[PDB]
Coordinates of all heavy atoms in Angstrom, one line a residue:
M89 N 2.0 8.8 20.1 CA 1.3 7.6 19.6 C 1.8 7.1 18.3 O 1.6 5.8 17.9 CB -0.2 7.8 19.6 CG -0.7 8.1 21.0 SD -2.5 8.1 21.1 CE -2.7 8.1 22.9
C90 N 2.5 7.9 17.5 CA 3.2 7.4 16.3 C 4.2 6.4 16.5 O 4.6 5.7 15.5 CB 3.8 8.6 15.5 SG 4.8 9.6 16.5
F91 N 4.7 6.2 17.8 CA 5.6 5.1 18.0 C 5.0 3.7 18.5 O 5.8 2.8 18.9 CB 6.7 5.5 19.0 CG 7.6 6.5 18.4 CD1 7.5 7.9 18.7 CD2 8.6 6.1 17.6 CE1 8.4 8.9 18.2 CE2 9.5 7.1 17.1 CZ 9.4 8.5 17.3
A92 N 3.7 3.6 18.5 CA 3.0 2.4 18.7 C 3.4 1.4 17.7 O 3.6 1.7 16.5 CB 1.5 2.5 18.6
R93 N 3.6 0.1 18.2 CA 3.8 -1.0 17.2 C 2.4 -1.4 16.7 O 1.6 -1.9 17.5 CB 4.5 -2.2 17.8 CG 4.6 -3.4 16.9 CD 5.4 -4.5 17.5 NE 4.7 -5.3 18.5 CZ 3.9 -6.4 18.2 NH1 3.8 -6.6 16.9 NH2 3.4 -7.2 19.1
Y94 N 2.1 -1.2 15.4 CA 0.9 -1.7 14.8 C 1.3 -3.0 14.1 O 2.3 -3.0 13.2 CB 0.3 -0.7 13.7 CG -0.6 0.3 14.3 CD1 -0.1 1.3 15.1 CD2 -1.9 0.1 14.2 CE1 -1.0 2.2 15.8 CE2 -2.9 1.1 14.8 CZ -2.4 2.1 15.6 OH -3.3 3.0 16.2
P95 N 0.7 -4.2 14.6 CA 1.0 -5.4 13.9 C 0.7 -5.3 12.4 O -0.1 -4.4 11.9 CB 0.0 -6.3 14.5 CG -0.1 -5.9 16.0 CD -0.2 -4.4 15.7
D96 N 1.4 -6.1 11.6 CA 1.2 -6.1 10.1 C -0.3 -6.2 9.7 O -0.8 -5.6 8.8 CB 1.9 -7.2 9.4 CG 1.7 -7.2 7.9 OD1 2.4 -6.4 7.1 OD2 0.8 -7.9 7.5
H97 N -1.0 -7.1 10.5 CA -2.4 -7.3 10.3 C -3.3 -6.1 10.5 O -4.5 -6.1 10.1 CB -2.9 -8.6 10.9 CG -3.1 -8.4 12.4 ND1 -2.1 -8.8 13.3 CD2 -4.2 -8.1 13.1 CE1 -2.6 -8.5 14.5 NE2 -3.9 -8.1 14.4
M98 N -2.8 -5.1 11.2 CA -3.5 -3.9 11.5 C -2.9 -2.6 10.9 O -3.2 -1.5 11.3 CB -3.4 -3.7 13.1 CG -4.5 -4.4 13.8 SD -4.2 -4.1 15.5 CE -5.0 -2.4 15.6
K99 N -2.0 -2.8 9.9 CA -1.3 -1.6 9.4 C -2.3 -0.6 8.8 O -1.9 0.6 8.7 CB -0.3 -2.0 8.4 CG 0.8 -2.7 9.0 CD 1.7 -2.0 10.0 CE 3.1 -2.6 9.7 NZ 4.0 -2.7 10.9
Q100 N -3.5 -1.0 8.3 CA -4.4 0.0 7.7 C -5.0 0.9 8.7 O -5.8 1.8 8.3 CB -5.4 -0.6 6.7 CG -4.5 -1.5 5.7 CD -5.1 -2.1 4.5 OE1 -6.2 -1.6 4.0 NE2 -4.5 -3.1 3.9
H101 N -4.8 0.6 10.0 CA -5.4 1.4 11.1 C -4.6 2.4 11.9 O -4.9 2.9 12.9 CB -6.1 0.4 12.1 CG -7.1 -0.5 11.3 ND1 -8.3 0.0 10.8 CD2 -6.9 -1.7 10.7 CE1 -8.8 -1.0 10.0 NE2 -8.0 -2.0 9.9
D102 N -3.4 2.6 11.3 CA -2.4 3.5 12.0 C -2.5 4.9 11.4 O -1.7 5.3 10.6 CB -1.0 2.9 11.8 CG 0.1 3.7 12.6 OD1 -0.2 4.7 13.2 OD2 1.3 3.1 12.6
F103 N -3.4 5.7 12.0 CA -3.6 7.1 11.6 C -2.3 7.9 11.8 O -1.9 8.8 11.1 CB -4.8 7.6 12.4 CG -4.8 9.1 12.5 CD1 -5.4 9.9 11.4 CD2 -4.1 9.8 13.5 CE1 -5.3 11.3 11.4 CE2 -4.0 11.3 13.5 CZ -4.7 12.0 12.5
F104 N -1.7 7.6 13.0 CA -0.6 8.4 13.5 C 0.6 8.5 12.6 O 1.1 9.6 12.3 CB -0.1 7.9 14.8 CG -1.2 7.8 15.8 CD1 -1.8 6.6 16.2 CD2 -1.8 9.0 16.5 CE1 -2.8 6.4 17.1 CE2 -2.8 8.8 17.4 CZ -3.3 7.6 17.7
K105 N 1.1 7.4 12.1 CA 2.2 7.4 11.1 C 1.7 7.9 9.7 O 2.4 8.6 9.0 CB 2.8 6.0 10.9 CG 3.4 5.5 12.2 CD 4.3 4.2 11.8 CE 4.7 3.4 13.1 NZ 3.6 3.3 14.2
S106 N 0.4 7.6 9.4 CA -0.2 8.1 8.1 C -0.1 9.6 7.9 O 0.0 10.1 6.8 CB -1.6 7.5 7.9 OG -2.5 8.4 8.4
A107 N -0.2 10.3 9.1 CA -0.2 11.8 9.1 C 1.2 12.4 8.9 O 1.3 13.5 8.9 CB -0.8 12.2 10.3
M108 N 2.2 11.5 9.0 CA 3.7 12.0 9.0 C 4.2 12.1 7.5 O 3.7 11.3 6.6 CB 4.5 11.0 9.8 CG 4.2 11.0 11.3 SD 4.6 12.6 12.0 CE 3.6 12.5 13.6
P109 N 5.2 12.9 7.3 CA 5.9 13.7 8.2 C 5.3 15.1 8.6 O 5.8 15.7 9.6 CB 7.3 14.0 7.5 CG 6.9 14.1 6.1 CD 5.8 13.1 5.9
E110 N 4.2 15.5 7.9 CA 3.7 16.8 8.2 C 3.1 17.0 9.6 O 3.1 18.1 10.2 CB 2.6 17.3 7.2 CG 3.2 17.2 5.7 CD 3.4 15.7 5.1 OE1 2.8 14.6 5.7 OE2 4.1 15.7 4.1
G111 N 2.6 15.8 10.1 CA 2.3 15.6 11.6 C 0.8 15.8 11.9 O -0.1 15.9 11.0
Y112 N 0.5 15.8 13.2 CA -0.9 15.9 13.7 C -0.9 16.8 14.9 O 0.1 17.0 15.6 CB -1.5 14.6 13.9 CG -0.8 13.7 14.8 CD1 -0.8 13.9 16.2 CD2 0.0 12.6 14.3 CE1 -0.2 13.0 17.1 CE2 0.7 11.7 15.2 CZ 0.6 11.9 16.6 OH 1.3 11.0 17.3
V113 N -2.1 17.4 15.1 CA -2.3 18.1 16.3 C -3.0 17.1 17.3 O -4.0 16.4 16.8 CB -3.3 19.3 16.1 CG1 -3.7 20.0 17.5 CG2 -2.6 20.3 15.2
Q114 N -2.6 17.0 18.5 CA -3.2 16.2 19.6 C -3.7 17.2 20.7 O -2.9 17.9 21.3 CB -2.2 15.3 20.1 CG -2.7 14.4 21.2 CD -1.9 13.2 21.5 OE1 -1.8 12.4 20.5 NE2 -1.5 12.9 22.7
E115 N -5.0 17.1 21.0 CA -5.6 18.0 22.0 C -6.3 17.2 23.0 O -6.8 16.2 22.6 CB -6.7 19.0 21.3 CG -6.0 19.9 20.4 CD -7.0 20.6 19.5 OE1 -7.7 19.9 18.8 OE2 -6.9 21.9 19.4
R116 N -6.2 17.6 24.2 CA -6.9 16.9 25.3 C -7.5 17.8 26.3 O -7.0 18.9 26.5 CB -5.9 16.0 26.1 CG -5.3 14.8 25.3 CD -5.2 13.6 26.3 NE -4.6 12.5 25.7 CZ -3.2 12.2 25.7 NH1 -2.4 13.0 26.2 NH2 -2.8 11.0 25.1
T117 N -8.5 17.4 27.0 CA -8.9 17.9 28.3 C -8.8 16.6 29.2 O -9.3 15.5 28.9 CB -10.4 18.4 28.3 OG1 -10.4 19.5 27.3 CG2 -10.7 18.9 29.6
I118 N -8.2 16.8 30.4 CA -8.0 15.8 31.4 C -8.6 16.3 32.7 O -8.1 17.3 33.3 CB -6.5 15.5 31.6 CG1 -5.7 15.2 30.3 CG2 -6.3 14.4 32.7 CD1 -4.2 15.2 30.5
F119 N -9.6 15.6 33.2 CA -10.3 16.0 34.4 C -9.8 15.2 35.5 O -9.9 13.9 35.5 CB -11.8 15.7 34.2 CG -12.5 16.6 33.1 CD1 -12.7 16.1 31.8 CD2 -12.9 17.9 33.5 CE1 -13.2 16.9 30.9 CE2 -13.5 18.7 32.5 CZ -13.7 18.2 31.2
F120 N -9.3 15.8 36.5 CA -8.8 15.1 37.7 C -10.1 15.1 38.7 O -10.5 16.1 39.1 CB -7.6 15.8 38.4 CG -6.4 15.6 37.6 CD1 -6.1 16.5 36.6 CD2 -5.6 14.4 37.7 CE1 -4.9 16.4 35.7 CE2 -4.5 14.3 36.8 CZ -4.2 15.3 35.8
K121 N -10.5 13.9 39.0 CA -11.7 13.7 40.0 C -11.4 14.5 41.3 O -10.4 14.4 41.9 CB -11.9 12.2 40.3 CG -13.4 12.0 40.8 CD -14.4 12.3 39.6 CE -15.9 12.2 39.8 NZ -16.2 11.1 40.8
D122 N -12.4 15.3 41.6 CA -12.5 16.2 42.8 C -11.4 17.3 42.8 O -11.0 17.7 43.8 CB -12.5 15.4 44.1 CG -13.7 14.5 44.2 OD1 -14.7 14.9 43.7 OD2 -13.5 13.3 44.7
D123 N -10.9 17.6 41.6 CA -9.8 18.6 41.4 C -9.9 19.3 40.1 O -11.0 19.3 39.4 CB -8.5 18.0 41.7 CG -7.4 18.9 42.4 OD1 -7.5 20.1 42.2 OD2 -6.5 18.4 43.0
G124 N -8.8 20.0 39.7 CA -8.8 20.7 38.4 C -8.7 19.9 37.2 O -8.8 18.6 37.2
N125 N -8.5 20.6 36.1 CA -8.3 20.0 34.8 C -7.1 20.5 34.1 O -6.9 21.7 34.2 CB -9.6 20.0 34.0 CG -10.0 21.4 33.5 OD1 -9.5 21.9 32.5 ND2 -11.1 22.0 34.1
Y126 N -6.6 19.7 33.2 CA -5.6 20.2 32.2 C -6.2 20.3 30.9 O -7.0 19.4 30.5 CB -4.4 19.2 32.1 CG -3.5 18.9 33.2 CD1 -2.7 17.7 33.3 CD2 -3.4 19.8 34.3 CE1 -1.8 17.6 34.4 CE2 -2.6 19.6 35.4 CZ -1.8 18.4 35.5 OH -0.9 18.2 36.5
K127 N -5.8 21.3 30.1 CA -6.2 21.4 28.7 C -4.9 21.5 28.0 O -4.1 22.4 28.4 CB -7.1 22.7 28.5 CG -8.5 22.3 28.9 CD -9.4 23.6 28.6 CE -10.9 23.1 29.0 NZ -11.3 23.2 30.4
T128 N -4.7 20.6 27.0 CA -3.4 20.6 26.3 C -3.6 20.6 24.7 O -4.6 20.2 24.2 CB -2.6 19.3 26.6 OG1 -3.3 18.2 26.1 CG2 -2.4 19.3 28.2
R129 N -2.6 21.2 24.0 CA -2.6 21.4 22.6 C -1.2 21.1 22.2 O -0.3 21.7 22.7 CB -3.0 22.8 22.1 CG -3.0 22.8 20.6 CD -3.5 24.1 20.0 NE -3.0 24.2 18.6 CZ -3.8 24.1 17.6 NH1 -5.1 24.1 17.7 NH2 -3.2 24.2 16.4
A130 N -1.0 20.0 21.4 CA 0.3 19.6 21.0 C 0.4 19.5 19.4 O -0.6 19.1 18.8 CB 0.8 18.3 21.6
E131 N 1.6 19.8 18.9 CA 1.8 19.4 17.5 C 3.0 18.4 17.5 O 4.0 18.6 18.1 CB 2.3 20.7 16.8 CG 1.2 21.7 16.7 CD 1.3 22.6 15.5 OE1 2.2 22.3 14.6 OE2 0.6 23.6 15.5

Side-chain angles (χ1 to χ4, degrees):
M89 299 188 168
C90 51
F91 291 101
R93 176 174 80 84
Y94 273 72
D96 179 80
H97 78 269
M98 275 181 81
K99 296 291 219 213
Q100 308 192 21
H101 306 288
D102 186 351
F103 160 84
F104 306 107
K105 300 190 190 44
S106 92
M108 294 296 164
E110 305 74 16
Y112 53 79
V113 172
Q114 182 161 298
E115 292 166 306
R116 294 218 185 89
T117 299
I118 308 170
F119 294 96
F120 292 89
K121 204 67 184 326
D122 300 327
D123 213 335
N125 66 85
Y126 294 161
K127 280 183 174 86
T128 68
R129 180 177 161 111
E131 288 209 19

